[PDB]
Design a protein around this ligand. Structure first.
Ligand SMILES: C=CC[C@@H]1/C=C(\C)C[C@H](C)C[C@H](OC)[C@H]2O[C@@](O)(C(=O)C(=O)N3CCCC[C@H]3C(=O)O[C@H](/C(C)=C/[C@@H]3CC[C@@H](O)[C@H](OC)C3)[C@H](C)[C@@H](O)CC1=O)[C@H](C)C[C@@H]2OC
Length: 120
């Protein structure tokens, strides 16, 4: 499943649940270290609804703590938390990927900051 490493610690009280909307700042890199996207470089944070299949599965799993099932190496991310998500080609864009930006069978690394959840 996805992998999460916690670089920094949030409030530890605010966690996203499926159907919740989250706001995130992120940089996305390949395992080789080349950046393919940054929310901050754009100057705009990303907002989405998690747990509805709106975004790739690795994002849905990490943000909702696996829909509350819990997971191996799956620590929960809270508001103000900084974490690294490693997403396998499954749970992301797969064998096809999305040209131009992503090659076939790519493992993706996201460095993310969870600015807010829902009302916040
Ligand atoms: C005209 C409007 C298009 C509309 C584009 C935007 C609102 C701007 C928004 C910042 C996207 C960025 O545009 C610069 C750019 O973000 C990336 O760089 C990226 O960091 C990424 O991977 N993200 C974004 C952050 C959340 C996780 C993931 C995602 O799941 O995002 C979602 C995603 C691509 C889902 C695919 C869709 C195809 C399915 O087949 C596949 O199923 C496996 C899942 C995004 C939100 C789409 O739902 C919404 C859109 O497409 C992609 C590398 C390519 C993507 O551009 C496409």
């Amino acid at each position: 499943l996805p992998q999460i490493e916690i670089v920094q610690e949030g409030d530890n009280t605010t966690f996203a649940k499926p159907g919740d909307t989250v706001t995130i700042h992120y940089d996305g890199k390949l395992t080789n270290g080349k950046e393919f996207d940054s929310s901050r470089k754009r100057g705009k944070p990303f907002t989405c609804t998690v747990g509805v299949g709106q975004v790739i599965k690795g994002w849905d799993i990490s943000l909702t703590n696996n829909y509350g099932k819990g997971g191996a190496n799956l620590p929960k991310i809270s508001k103000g938390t900084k974490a690294i998500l490693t997403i396998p080609p499954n749970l992301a864009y797969g064998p096809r990927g999305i040209p131009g930006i992503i090659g076939p069978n790519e493992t993706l690394v996201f460095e993310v900051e969870l600015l807010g959840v829902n009302g916040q």
